[PDB]
Amino acid sequence: RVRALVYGHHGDPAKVVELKNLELAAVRGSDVRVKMLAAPINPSDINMIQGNYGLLPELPAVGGNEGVAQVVAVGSNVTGLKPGDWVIPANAGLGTWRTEAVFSEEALIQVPSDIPLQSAATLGVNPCTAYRMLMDFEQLQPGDSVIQNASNSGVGQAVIQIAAALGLRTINVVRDRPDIQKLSDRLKSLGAEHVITEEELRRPEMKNFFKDMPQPRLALNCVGGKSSTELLRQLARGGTMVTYGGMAKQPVVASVSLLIFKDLKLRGFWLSQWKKDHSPDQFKELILTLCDLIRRGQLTAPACSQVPLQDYQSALEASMKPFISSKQILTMLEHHHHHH
Template identity: 40%
Template sequence: MATARSVTLKAASTSLWSLNRSSPKAKTVRALSTIMSPPSKAVVYEHHGPPDTVTRMIELSPVEVKENQVCVKMLAAPINPSDINRVYPVRPQVPAVGGYEGVGEVYSVGSAVKGLSPGDLVIPSPLSSGLFFAPFDRLLLFCFECLKFKIGTWQTYVVKDHDTWHKISKDSPIEYAATITVNPLTALRMLEDFTTLTAGDSVVQNGATSIVGQCVIQLARYRGIHSINIIRDRAGSDTVKEKLKALGADEVFTESQLEVKNVKSLLSNIPGPALGLNCVGGNAASLVLKFLRQGGTMVTYGGMSKKPITVPISCFIFKDLSLKGFWVQKWLTADRTKECREMVDYLLRLAQEGKLKYEMELVPFGKFHTALDKALGKHGSQPKQVIKF
C-alpha cells in the first residue's frame, strides 16, 4: 500500500511535473521517475545584518521531492521577533530562507510517504525545528545541525522530509495555524511547567499586551486562574486595559500605578500569585517579583527592555523565590514529540472555538518588506504581521 499512494500535482505547469505517476501499479516506473517541486519564491538572507537590508525575495529552482519527502505549498507564515532580532546566540548558516513558523497545504508527496496526502493542512512539526540543540557551550555546532532541519517558511513551496510536518485539522483557522507553535505554546507551557495552578489561583505577568501575554490571559481565564497584568505607561493605556479585560484579564496596571509601597494591597479578592512571567526585564521584572507570594517562581522568556533583572537578596533568602527561564525552542525535544503535537492540536481547537484569539494583520507575500518594516517597529505599535501566500 505504500507505493499505492496517489500523488496529485495541483499545478503541474512545467515539463518536469508531468513525470509524476499516479497509478498504484507503476512502482518500478515511479522509482525511476522524479517528482519535482514547483519553483519557489523565497525571502532569503545571504548575510547577517539588519533584516530590512539583508533580506531579499528571489526565485528558487524546482527541487526533487525524494521518496520520504513532502512538498508543501505555504499558505501563511508570521514574522516573529525571533526571526528578526539579534538577541539569539545562534545564527543559521547563510544563505538561508527566513521564517520559522507557518502553515501550508501538502502539494505532492514522495513515493514512500505514508499518512500525508495532497490537500492536507500541515505545519512544520514543532519538534523538527528545535530538535538539535547543543549545550550552550557548544552552540557553534548547533548552527550546522540546525540548518539541516530548518524549514524556512518564508517561501511559496517547501520540500522537506515527511516527519518534518505535522498534519492539523483542515478546519483550523489559517492565521492561527501559522502562529500557534511559538507564542501560544510558550504561554501554555509556562502556565503548566513551573507551578501547579488550579482554579482560583493567580498569575502575574508583564508585557501583557504581547501575543504570549494575551494567550496567558485567555488560557488562565479558561482554567479559572486570575491574571494580574502589567503594561507600559503610554498614551491610550486605558483602551489597552479595556482590551485586555475583554480577553479575561482580572487586573491590569501600568508600571507607574505600581509605584506604591505594597503592590499586593492593590489586589482585591485575588490571592498572591505563585507564578510570574517576565518578558521585559528591568523595572517591569521587579514589579513581577513584588507581586509574587512566598515561594513563588518568576519565569523569564524575553527581555524587551534590554535591561537585566535586579533581585534583592531577601527575595531569595526570606521570600524563597525561584527565578527560571523558558525558551520554547529549547523545550522542544525529541521525547516531547507526541505531547507537543497534542498541545498544538489543543491550542488550535481553542482558536477555532474562539477561546483563544489575538490580533494579526495578514499581508500578501509581495508586500513582505512592508510587513517586515511594521514588524521591526518602524511604524509604531502594530499587530503581528502574518504573510499570506
C-alpha cells in the same frame, strides 16, 4: 519558481533580508512538497536575523520559523500526510517565509484544517508558549493568580485567554500609553481580570492593592531590568518568575532579599528546546489541545495585518516598532480583499 525571504548576513532585518528566487528540491521517499499559506513575523525570527539567538540557521538562510502550509506532493514512502493537509514545522529553524519548499515528513506536524487559517499560522509558537509556561513551572488550580508583563504581545494575549480557560485570575502589566483605557477593555474582553501599567507596578503600595485576589505564585516576564524586579516583587513566597523573551542589554535583575528571604525562583522557557526534547506526538497533543480550545471558543487569534510576501519590507518595518501597530503576518494567498 520559489520566492523566498533570504538573509546572507546577520543585521537589521529591514536591511539584510531580500526576496530571492530559489528552485525546489526533489521529493525523496520520506519528503513532502508544501505550499506555504501564511507565516507571522515573531520576535524570535527578528533575533535570528539580528544574530542574537540560541539557534542560528546556516547562512544564507530563509527567514521565519512559524507558518502553515498545504501539502501538495508526497514521497513514495509517506502514508501519514496527504495532498491538501495543513502542516506546520515540527521545530524552529525551518525557514517559512517562502512560497514553496520540500521538507522531510518528520520536520512537519499536521494541523486540523477546520480552524481558521490565521489561527493555524500562529498556533505553533505563541499559544504553545503560553500553555507550556502555565503548566510546566507551578501547579496552578482554578482561582490561582498569574502576573505577566508585555501583556499586549502575542504570548501575552495567549496567556490571558489560556489562563482564563484554566480558571486562573490574571494581572496583566502593560506599557503606559495614551489609549490605555481602550487597551485595558480589550484585554479584559479576552479574559484579563486586571490590567495595570509599568508605572503602577513600580509603586511600593501596589504589592497588596488587589485585595480580592490571591498573590500569584507564577510571574511571566519578557521585559527585564527594573521592570522584571518589580514583577518579582509581586510573587508569593516560593513563587517562580519565568523569562521567555527580552533583550541583551536589559538582563533580569533579582534583589538578594527577594531570592533569600522570599525564596523566589527564576527560570527560563524556550519552546524550541521543549520541542527538541519532546516527541512530534507530544507536540501534536499540545496542538490538538489548543485546537479544542479554539473550537470551544476559548482561544481566538489576535488582530493581524495580512501582508503579501512581496510587501515584506513594510511588514518588517511594522514589527520593529516599539509600540507594534498590530501583529504582521505574511500571506502567500490572495484573499477576497486585494492588498497592493
